[PDB]
Amino acid sequence: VRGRTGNVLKLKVNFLPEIITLSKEVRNLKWLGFRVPLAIVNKAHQANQLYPFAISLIESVRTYER
Amino acid sequence: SAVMSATFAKFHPNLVVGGTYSGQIVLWDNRSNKRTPVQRTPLSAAAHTHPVYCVNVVGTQNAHNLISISTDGKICS
Numbered sequence: 470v471r472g473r474t475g476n477v478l479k480l481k482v483n484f485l486p487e488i489i490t491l492s493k494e495v496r497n498l499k500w501l502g503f504r505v506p507l508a509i510v511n512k513a514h515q516a517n518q519l520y521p522f523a524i525s526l527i528e529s530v531r532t533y534e535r
Numbered sequence: 536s537a538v539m540s541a542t543f544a545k546f547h548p549n550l551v552v553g554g555t556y557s558g559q560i561v562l563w564d565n566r567s568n569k570r571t572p573v574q575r576t577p578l579s580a581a582a583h584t585h586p587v588y589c590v591n592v593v594g595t596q597n598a599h600n601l602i603s604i605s606t607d608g609k610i611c612s
Binding site: 488492495517518520521522524525527528 | 536556557558559577578579580582583584585586606
């Protein structure tokens, strides 16, 4: 949903704050591989594989809306 | 996209290129009626997954190899 005149609603990808967290997970694991639970490792593996496809979808949304 | 290390292009001063945060690399051309990149890279498996931190030229116009270093442990010349 979008907030402006006319009450329009735009497009979106559900991977907006995941890019930052994936960078955090990649740096925390390659940097030293800290005492990070395997659930976070599962999140990193489930979202890093989507990360280029996710931001490509973000590119599609941004260019389509532009 | 968030371009990281947009370096030059040897023997192509106006055909500037740049690696991005998305994992793709973008090639601009000021003299192509598009300041937006005229040669964008898709974010498929051929390109990089993680952010492309260092795109860089290797060799002259004969072997214009453009190594795009990414944070995936994968680079693309």
